[PDB]
Design a binder for this molecule. Sequence first.
Ligand code: HEM
Length: 153
Amino acid sequence: VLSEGEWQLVLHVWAKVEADVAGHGQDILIRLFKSHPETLEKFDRFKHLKTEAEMKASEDLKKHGVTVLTALGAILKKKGHHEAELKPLAQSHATKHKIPIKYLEFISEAIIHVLHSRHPGDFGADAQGAMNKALELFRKDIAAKYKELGYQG
Ligand code: HEM
């Protein structure tokens, strides 16, 4: 489980992300798409983007980054008591968007990398370990909903 001190590390760095939600969101999605190109194919909205420069110039991509980080922040601020928020997300990602759990692992790695690049002083090893645990909890709870619906695999 996460301890109170671990949650405090997570939420202290998250308060810094919220001073620039759009910029963080852009960086995280670009990192995902460049490191794991198969993920771009799940987005009919974005699959025309071929270069990093094109990704950086897209306002629609920046808008989706804000949607993703706003939803994640709402989950993290519940400190584990996130059923109401998480259940609808799991349902749409399993049955409509068809996102494998592995791609949730990939985006979690992208989040960690961008937080370390933008906030080294508040993102030392202790904070990294707490954020990894928070994102593991997120994935574990989505995976349990996927299995109920027959999408875990
Ligand atoms: C931190 C993880 C993630 C969060 C919090 C998140 C959140 C959201 C939210 C709030 C929406 C809009 C409402 C909905 O459709 O449920 C959405 C849409 C979507 N997400 Fe996720 N997402 C995450 C990861 C991913 C990943 C890894 C992929 C693909 C590789 C993905 C693919 C999509 C798609 C295709 C849509 C629909 C976009 C559109 O065409 O409007 N998501 N996501």
